[PDB]
Design goal:
The chain is built from 2 helices and 12 strands, in the order αββββββββββαββ. The chain has 237 residues and is mainly beta. The two termini are 38 Å apart. The protein binds ligand WIN, chloride ion (4 copies), potassium ion, magnesium ion (50 copies), sodium ion (23 copies) and strontium ion (SR) (54 copies). It binds 2 RNA strands through helix 1, helix 2, strand 11 and strand 12.
Length: 237
RNA sequence: CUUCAAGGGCGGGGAGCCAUGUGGACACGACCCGAAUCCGGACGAUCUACGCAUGGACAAGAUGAAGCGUGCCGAAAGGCACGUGGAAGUCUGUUAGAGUUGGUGUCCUACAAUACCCUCUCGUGAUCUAUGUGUAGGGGUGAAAGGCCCAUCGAGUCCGGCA
RNA sequence: UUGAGGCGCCCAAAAUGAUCGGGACUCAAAUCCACCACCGAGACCUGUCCGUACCACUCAUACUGGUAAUCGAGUAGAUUGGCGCUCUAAUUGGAUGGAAGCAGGGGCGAGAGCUCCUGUGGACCGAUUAGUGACGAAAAUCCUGGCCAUAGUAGCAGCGAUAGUCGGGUGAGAACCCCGACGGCCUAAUGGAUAAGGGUUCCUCAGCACUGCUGAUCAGCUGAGGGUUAGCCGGUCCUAAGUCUCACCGCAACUCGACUGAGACGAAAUGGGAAACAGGUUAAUAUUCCUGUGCCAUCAUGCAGUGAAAGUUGACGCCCUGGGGUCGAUCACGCCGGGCAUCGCCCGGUCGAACCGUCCAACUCCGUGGAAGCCGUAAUGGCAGGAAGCGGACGAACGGCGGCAUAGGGAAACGUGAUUCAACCUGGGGCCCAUGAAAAGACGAGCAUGAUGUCCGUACCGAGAACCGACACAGGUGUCCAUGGCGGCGAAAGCCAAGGCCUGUCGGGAGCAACCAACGUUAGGGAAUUCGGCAAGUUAGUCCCGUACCUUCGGAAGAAGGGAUGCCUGCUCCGGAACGGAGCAGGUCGCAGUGACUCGGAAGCUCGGACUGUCUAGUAACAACAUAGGUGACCGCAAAUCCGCAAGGACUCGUACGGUCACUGAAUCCUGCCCAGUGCAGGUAUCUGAACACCUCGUACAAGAGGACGAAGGACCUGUCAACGGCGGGGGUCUUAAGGUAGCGUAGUACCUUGCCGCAUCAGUAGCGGCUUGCAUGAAUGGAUUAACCAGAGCUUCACUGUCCCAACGUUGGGCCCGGUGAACUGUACAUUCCAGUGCGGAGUCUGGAGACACCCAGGGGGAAGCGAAGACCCUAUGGAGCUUUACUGCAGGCUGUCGCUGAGGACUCUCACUCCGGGAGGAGGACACCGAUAGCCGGGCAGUUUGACUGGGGCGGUACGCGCUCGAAAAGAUAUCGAGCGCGCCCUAUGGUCAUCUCAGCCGGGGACCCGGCGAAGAGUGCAAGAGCAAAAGAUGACUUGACAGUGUUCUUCCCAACGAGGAACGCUGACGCGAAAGCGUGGUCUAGCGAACCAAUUAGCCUGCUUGAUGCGGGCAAUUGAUGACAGAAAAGCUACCCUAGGGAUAACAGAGUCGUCACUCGCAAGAGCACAUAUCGACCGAGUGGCUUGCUACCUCGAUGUCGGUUCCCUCCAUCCUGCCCGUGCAGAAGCGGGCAAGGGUGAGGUUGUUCGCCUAUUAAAGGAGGUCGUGAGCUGGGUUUAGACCGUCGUGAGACAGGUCGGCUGCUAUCUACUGGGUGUGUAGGUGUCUGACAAGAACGACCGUAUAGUACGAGAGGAACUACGGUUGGUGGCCACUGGUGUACCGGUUGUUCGAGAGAGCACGUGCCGGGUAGCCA
């Protein structure tokens, strides 16, 4: 047949790419040697085209203008501290060791000094639970207990822009606009509505899949469609 | 040669070798033309699909969302009236522009290898559009019709494989 | 009275014109019995000649003689002699006293062909012999070129742009070249400036051979000259999506490839950007030249200045809105000029830039001030954290103001105020799950004077003739002018300026016919039309009143329905005002006041999809795609998913409120049951599970064999259906897990089926409601429901109408005639046909007849199975391609073990390789991971292929695909069909072999076991089909035995004849045996079925052999046994295609024709039976005999290089088996009305409701509303509703692609007539100069058909009820021909009214599509 849509994706053509040239900043944490004497004042609160959540413009003590991931409640004029012995205030970045247990945290690092990987979407938060000299157990937004290094930096508080998923898109045009700002080809034509040549579920006199939808993990790209390695399907049982 | 044995098979009392013509056979293009393929390397996004960059376009009218206001009633929460406001993949619209339902009209050696006329649809949006730019052939692109990729597509075009 | 024979008669119906070939024939020109004489082949006889064969003579196949009664046709094909062409060679010739070639002509040869003469030509040409070969054409939808008919034919008309006319000019020539006048056309374009693209097309002069839809003196044509001038307009510079180069790395390699660096490129209308305005000038340039004035940058000098870089700018989305404000437009008034002349109105102008200077609203801010309720807006809003008010800092226009300007421009005047105000300036508000460039540059940061400011573009077109589309193409092609006037809501219509044009480039003529394209008007009726209101029409703008069901409360809604609408006089209200809006009173005209133009028809029921949106560029716009919403799945990021061979990369400036992979498809109510199969995932004691390493055997080693351990995977267990999917049969469980819950239901799903009931209609296969056992409904394969929406499917009502009854008249362009220009399709030939026949069964050409004087014009298209396309349907080919899958075989990819990288101390620690994070220090991880290699599993993701044959086409079914028997089979042998009956793919250690003894079925008699006797040629038994063989046996019993043995042949069979393997049989020999006294019998079973190649393996016995050589291992071979190919003389092998493609076939199907006629229709014979009695008024079984060619079927003759489908329609002819009408006979005939029958085809046989229907059902009329043929008449006539392409849905089936003789929505209709045919019109010739009048061979007719009513008559008849006829009248209906006094239509003749706009008003006119609209309408033509 012909290569399926998921195969055209990896080629990285214009249609499947993200409008990077229209994106503001790659939100990473500031690189401090040691100490704490790094503080800044929030100049502006901007809209980030990349994640739909707001982003805070901060100017530091050493005169560095960089955008940072905005938590809830952080406004213009406010002072945020970054360092080891930073004040345990919402919006401050300090390693997981220094942050007390049972406190909601965002922009958590994987390997210490990477700039933040986990809990970065609108209104989400990671929960810090257990402490040790070796490990800091953080409960990520998916409900998974991630065992992390205590030297991994994290910003205190939940991410701003919460409850975005609550209000519906209502009309196709609103989805259109959102998708034109992301790295996604939209709209989605069902495989079952295509020809046999185009997709494993294409063909027939009526629209139904050919074989069962639950595909094996070992399936090759071109065949791996539908329910990928499903442990189960349905709602009941 | 096979064989206790027997019986069988093949060969045996000197004609061949070479040359020229000619009949016929096999491989090769194989008396000549005749078709849909398959494969290789190249040339195409001046058409068209989808994306991107930078620009441009949308008479006039209708309907009157939220919010705000004033008056009245109420302890209050509020409610009602009027006004204000001017929302909308909103309506009418041959505005510009886009599209193409019916006539199965005209044309059908055409004006035209997709045209003409009337009728019809959309027309502030998932809108239309110019230019620049990207994606290339078992690959693109596809709101999916096997649609489109320069009058070429259930696998483009050119030349080669090839007689 | 009865029998037999001969000929004839009845029985006896078919479609364009009857037939024995025709004429025609009757003591024959018939038939039968005899007879006589003739005609009539290429046969037969005969003269001569020829070829061939043979004989004699001969070197001869050279002559000559002879023989053929026993030689003389021939496709494919075998054999043989010869003709002609090119060039070579030897030998030998011809030619300027005329070669070859060509044209016409003479002679020879059976012929291929040879040769001569005359003319032409003007330089080469032969012959014989031996060679050479790019050596011979009527054909291939053959190739190239040329040419004819077609034909002086089509086109030069059709487009909302209908364009011209009269004079004159120039010229050899003028409809179209130029001037004037008159008349028109274009208004977002037909005007102005440009981008791209073109490329000299621009200007001048000279031209007409080319080009130009005719002509041309003209030109975008031909030729020659000429023409594009820049510091300040673009390029140039900057950066955008992004591109390239270099380096680096990959790659076998590169002109290849991703990342990372560096550099460069990347914007001419339309991103950013230092600077120019006014006028004049040329045939052609112009912010470029010239005049005037101005500005920018750099640099030099001089003065100033020490500031200098922070900041600002460049620099930015969509929606609403205020303020400032120019041009324009309009109003007032004044001046200048023009126009008009019943008025005094109308038009044009009244100018003046860049720049320099100056003014500043908005915003922001400061001082003052002191609001507790005030300030403020179009709106939001603002404030003791300090409102209003007052003063102030900062600060805008492409704007005002002054200069510029005793510049420029104007014939002149050379204005002033106003309103609305594009540009431009500056603010306020709102929206985003959308957040709306960058860089160079500028500012920040003065002034003089002088210098420099190079390079590239610059013409013209920019389109119904300069671009793309082969064209001077009705197509396509971006930007700015969006503010010219009236009009009106308007960038709308209509009209008109400025400007442009008469080049959407052939004309002239005919009241101008038919016919066609566009269109106007049609009385009465009003959808009767049609699949369907298709087409057309109706409605319409604005204000007032008023407005249902339902609803998601938004909507429905402009629901529906009703009223109003002009002009004139004078006014009121809102507002600063408008040349803005809203109203009032009085008067007044028309048929009509949104008077033209512009401008919705309305309502209801149902199906689908919720909605806006998307789509098959070019037959599908839809119910299909998308969508929000719903849901499931995967993944913590060193992720999941995806791309790359690699280096690397998308997602990702992303992180679960994420984004990947799928399904369902808004909201609302819901979404049952099943985990057996399949799929996915988890688990797993045990079983199974590869390679490496390890152990055993083996080999001096190795191959090799076995074991041990055992990963993923599998077995097994569990989870899971919003995962593929399933939800029945039976009974009061069974398959295979469950056994259909809510709902919905004759559905776009229901076969039956037009289901039943109801609604509605005269009538309703439709539609809607209800019922509903549902062939075969049903829950995210989503069920139900639903307001709103729709160029979606169906139905009903009101309104409207030429859709129809039923057609008419008119308008414009064609059409017809003339001038000019000038194709194409098509063509084997011949061709004046017609009716029949025949023929490969569908003939202009054959046969027989009939008809037919030639030529030409116009026509509509009957025929040429017309022209167009090597049929898409169907089959076939060891054809192709796309697609599917649990087809065959493989290839990527994923998972997993093992080896290398890889290190220290069956579970563990470490750090040093290696990986990742961190800028770094250092941190995480770590011998793992990555990578290289190998092994096992999964693996249509991808590739190559296969998927047979037979067959009354193919599929399905079957196997007549290898074998045996009987019959078919025609008394030797051979013999077919999907011919009839039926078998074999073994079985047996005895059921084989021999010998001895013996005789069986069945029956009878004596004591179904057993015993004795008799009869008993064979019916018993003999393994199994059938046919055949057998009695001291081939059967039975008994005993002994293993010949069912080894080896090698002969022959027949397999395969008649007649080649062919395996297999088989009969018959021998050699060896060894068994039995018997012996002869002898035993090469399996009495005979005919019970079977298998090569390659490879295993097995048996002996031997041969392996590369210099010996030993060992392991191999190669001679002979033979076993293992299977049943498609059985042997491939390892599944499907779909409607997305399709090719080669062919009428070798083969679908239509139709043709044959047949079982079927169908009709008839006839006999006449049981009943009809109260009565066969025969009427009905009529069984059986028998037929005719037709309307049904169906059969066959495969005709066509697959195409004979267009069903139904319908329109128009013509016919048949009779007669429905009516006429004339008749019978009656169970009183009458009336009927029933049955006969003759008869003249005429008629109609309108409607459902359905595509044919058919049929139904309604009302009727004299009756008959049937059938003409290629199921009729698509070069129409329609396109059904069938039957490509799109889609439902049900069913399928794992799937996809299918269905199921349903459903959508889905294209080519061509200029050569021949023939006919309808009409002419010109010639014949009869043989004229005028007028006739005749009538023949030809056509339906010219007429039918009904009702009155008198007869309430009469005959009949108890009555009821109720006729002859005849005479009047009318109606259908058809026919003609005519227009009358009625009616038309009447773009004409007259009137009136809306808009333009000519100033008036008068009088143009335009509004070929009349703006409305009213009336003569002639004519018409019903
Ligand atoms: C121009 O068309 C033809 O001539 C055809 O003749 C009648 C016909 C055919 C063919 O004869 C022939 O090809 C049938 C008569 C042949 C037949 O056997 C059969 O069963 C049917 C169904 C035919 C009817 C008609 O069918 C056409 O498709 C077929 O039409 C076509 O095949 C095609 C046409 C009109 C064009 C698309 C080429 C007809
Ligand atoms: Cl999303
Ligand atoms: Cl000869
Ligand atoms: Cl330019
Ligand atoms: Cl404001
Ligand atoms: K045919
Ligand atoms: Mg980041
Ligand atoms: Mg996008
Ligand atoms: Mg979808
Ligand atoms: Mg499809
Ligand atoms: Mg596939
Ligand atoms: Mg579906
Ligand atoms: Mg489905
Ligand atoms: Mg382009
Ligand atoms: Mg309002
Ligand atoms: Mg399809
Ligand atoms: Mg010689
Ligand atoms: Mg020749
Ligand atoms: Mg020939
Ligand atoms: Mg002609
Ligand atoms: Mg005109
Ligand atoms: Mg000239
Ligand atoms: Mg032209
Ligand atoms: Mg009428
Ligand atoms: Mg219509
Ligand atoms: Mg007032
Ligand atoms: Mg229906
Ligand atoms: Mg829709
Ligand atoms: Mg289409
Ligand atoms: Mg549509
Ligand atoms: Mg969804
Ligand atoms: Mg759908
Ligand atoms: Mg019904
Ligand atoms: Mg369910
Ligand atoms: Mg063919
Ligand atoms: Mg194939
Ligand atoms: Mg790294
Ligand atoms: Mg395949
Ligand atoms: Mg076959
Ligand atoms: Mg015989
Ligand atoms: Mg084999
Ligand atoms: Mg063996
Ligand atoms: Mg065979
Ligand atoms: Mg055989
Ligand atoms: Mg074909
Ligand atoms: Mg045939
Ligand atoms: Mg025909
Ligand atoms: Mg009769
Ligand atoms: Mg008749
Ligand atoms: Mg009808
Ligand atoms: Mg027919
Ligand atoms: Mg015809
Ligand atoms: Mg036709
Ligand atoms: Mg025609
Ligand atoms: Mg239909
Ligand atoms: Mg249909
Ligand atoms: Na091939
Ligand atoms: Na393109
Ligand atoms: Na309101
Ligand atoms: Na159209
Ligand atoms: Na290809
Ligand atoms: Na022959
Ligand atoms: Na002309
Ligand atoms: Na100024
Ligand atoms: Na819309
Ligand atoms: Na199951
Ligand atoms: Na079902
Ligand atoms: Na629509
Ligand atoms: Na008409
Ligand atoms: Na004809
Ligand atoms: Na194909
Ligand atoms: Na086969
Ligand atoms: Na044999
Ligand atoms: Na018959
Ligand atoms: Na028909
Ligand atoms: Na008759
Ligand atoms: Na026919
Ligand atoms: Na037809
Ligand atoms: Na047609
Ligand atoms: Sr980083
Ligand atoms: Sr990061
Ligand atoms: Sr499918
Ligand atoms: Sr459930
Ligand atoms: Sr392009
Ligand atoms: Sr508007
Ligand atoms: Sr149509
Ligand atoms: Sr036309
Ligand atoms: Sr066409
Ligand atoms: Sr029309
Ligand atoms: Sr509209
Ligand atoms: Sr809209
Ligand atoms: Sr070739
Ligand atoms: Sr008769
Ligand atoms: Sr002869
Ligand atoms: Sr002969
Ligand atoms: Sr030749
Ligand atoms: Sr030549
Ligand atoms: Sr010619
Ligand atoms: Sr004309
Ligand atoms: Sr122009
Ligand atoms: Sr001339
Ligand atoms: Sr010119
Ligand atoms: Sr550049
Ligand atoms: Sr520019
Ligand atoms: Sr204003
Ligand atoms: Sr045009
Ligand atoms: Sr067009
Ligand atoms: Sr004018
Ligand atoms: Sr012309
Ligand atoms: Sr009239
Ligand atoms: Sr109707
Ligand atoms: Sr009304
Ligand atoms: Sr399109
Ligand atoms: Sr729903
Ligand atoms: Sr299961
Ligand atoms: Sr039930
Ligand atoms: Sr004849
Ligand atoms: Sr004609
Ligand atoms: Sr058949
Ligand atoms: Sr025997
Ligand atoms: Sr199958
Ligand atoms: Sr289909
Ligand atoms: Sr009668
Ligand atoms: Sr009807
Ligand atoms: Sr029929
Ligand atoms: Sr029927
Ligand atoms: Sr007929
Ligand atoms: Sr149709
Ligand atoms: Sr049907
Ligand atoms: Sr069907
Ligand atoms: Sr004569
Ligand atoms: Sr009476
Ligand atoms: Sr007119």
């Amino acid at each position: 047949g012909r290569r399926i849509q998921g195969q055209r994706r990896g080629r990285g053509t214009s249609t499947f790419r993200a409008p990077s040239h229209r994106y503001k900043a790659d939100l990473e944490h500031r690189k401090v040697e040691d100490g704490d004497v790094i503080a800044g004042t929030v100049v502006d609160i901007e809209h980030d085209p990349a994640r739909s959540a707001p982003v805070a413009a901060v100017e530091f003590e050493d005169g560095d203008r960089r955008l940072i991931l905005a938590p809830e409640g952080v406004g213009v004029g406010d002072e945020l501290q970054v360092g080891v012995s930073a004040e345990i205030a919402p919006g401050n970045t300090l390693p997981l060791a220094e942050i007390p247990e049972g406190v909601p945290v965002c922009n958590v690092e994987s390997s210490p000094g990477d700039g933040g990987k986990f809990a970065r979407a609108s209104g989400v938060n990671a929960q810090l639970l257990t402490h040790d000299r070796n490990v800091a157990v953080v409960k990520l937004p998916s409900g998974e207990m991630k065992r992390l290094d205590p030297q991994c930096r994290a910003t205190i508080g939940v991410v701003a822009g919460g409850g975005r998923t609550d209000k519906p898109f209502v009309k196709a045009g609103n989805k259109h606009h959102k998708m034109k700002a992301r790295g996604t080809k939209w709209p989605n034509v069902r495989g079952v509505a295509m020809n046999a040549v185009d997709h494993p579920f294409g063909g027939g006199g009526r629209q139904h899949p050919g074989k069962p939808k639950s595909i094996s993990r070992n399936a090759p790209p071109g065949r791996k469609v539908g329910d990928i390695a499903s442990k189960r399907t349905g709602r009941g049982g």
